[PDB]
């Protein structure tokens, strides 16, 4: 019609078929720890270090997420962790970090991720202070397309924030960390996410859907463009009071277009929140603030990035060797991993 929208609906149809075959037949046990030279800690998550590694027989570099199995059980994250790996090995999209290999041993789960030399958007955002709107828009557009992709697969992402967005060598985004991703038709109830980014319906124990991802996009755009999030305080409890209060103030330098997009994304009323209406994602894609955005050009990476990572430069850590136990821990819990 809608010649554009028809090309969208056909691409998504084929993508969903690729995803479904992998969703039903997950890749499993595709490597071993001794095939990877462990170089240094890139960062940390709840369940272990994320290591910079080199695959010995190819010389490729990856980020290897280690997950202590006992720590996953103790944090009651077994099902979320199985979701994470099953979803991540099945999706395929330019702005999604690829799960190149996964495996486990007696002690750990390992997820061998595509490596982004730029690291986390969070680091660059805090250092520079804030992104100008064209810079923020470039990143936002990639998130818009990625949520359109994921939501068509019945996937909710549930942990959007700058900490989880990596900058690649071309200056584009890769969404990392699928720890809370979930394939659900209809509503779900888990209280999970990051306080500053929680939609009101989550805080209110209301039952929710993909619209929490669109609210979270509003927080991210705001934080990228302002240098601070729209709702912050010293304690999460004070953050939640502001989120549900129905109130938000924009910096004096936000364009009126930006403020209008964010008022429709940061809408406490689900029935009025952009992304959740009759036109779905297109109330966002066709918004004023995105008028200069060439969505196809973004997808095929023809747009010049506003920022390319400085071509050594990592936060130092104390580095200890991986200890693999003599006995298998939590074998039945993670059987399908």
């Amino acid at each position: 019609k809608g010649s554009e929208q028809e090309s969208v609906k056909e691409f998504l149809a084929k993508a969903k078929e690729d995803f479904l075959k992998k969703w039903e037949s997950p890749a499993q046990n595709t490597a071993h720890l001794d095939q990877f030279e462990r170089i240094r800690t890139l960062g940390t998550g709840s369940f272990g270090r994320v290591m910079l590694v080199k695959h010995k027989e190819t010389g490729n570099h990856y980020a290897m997420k280690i997950l202590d199995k006992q720590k996953v059980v103790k944090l009651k994250q077994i099902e979320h962790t199985l979701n994470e790996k099953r979803i991540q090995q099945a999706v395929n999209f330019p702005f999604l970090v690829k799960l190149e290999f996964s495996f486990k041993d007696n002690s750990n789960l390992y997820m061998v991720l595509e490596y982004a030399p730029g690291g986390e958007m969070f680091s660059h955002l805090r250092r520079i202070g804030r992104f100008s709107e064209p810079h923020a828009r470039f990143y936002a557009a990639q998130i818009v397309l990625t949520f359109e992709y994921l939501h068509s697969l019945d996937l909710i992402y549930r942990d959007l924030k700058p900490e989880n967005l990596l900058i690649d060598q071309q200056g584009y985004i890769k969404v990392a960390d699928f720890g809370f991703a979930k394939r659900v038709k209809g509503r779900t109830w888990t209280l999970c996410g990051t306080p500053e980014y929680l939609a009101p319906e989550i805080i209110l124990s209301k039952g929710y859907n993909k619209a929490v991802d669109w609210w979270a996009l509003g927080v991210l755009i705001y934080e990228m463009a302002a240098g601070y999030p729209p709702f912050f305080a010293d304690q999460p409890i004070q953050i939640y009071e502001k989120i549900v209060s129905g109130k938000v103030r924009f910096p004096s330098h936000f364009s009126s277009d930006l403020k209008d997009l964010l008022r429709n994304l940061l809408q406490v009323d689900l029935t009025k929140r952009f992304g959740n209406l009759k036109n779905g994602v297109n109330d966002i894609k066709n918004h004023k603030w995105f008028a200069t955005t060439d969505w196809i050009a973004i997808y095929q990476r023809k747009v010049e990035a506003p920022f390319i990572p400085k071509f050594s430069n990592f936060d130092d850590y104390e580095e200890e060797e991986i200890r693999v136990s003599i006995n298998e821990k939590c074998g039945k819990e993670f059987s399908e991993f």
Partner: peptide
């Protein structure tokens, strides 16, 4: 300024997810 209030706050580092 709001920026100054943010920078002086305890939530300018990497933020942990909640797990309930």
């Amino acid at each position: 300024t709001t920026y100054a209030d943010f920078i002086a706050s305890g939530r300018t580092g990497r933020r942990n997810a909640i797990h309930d």
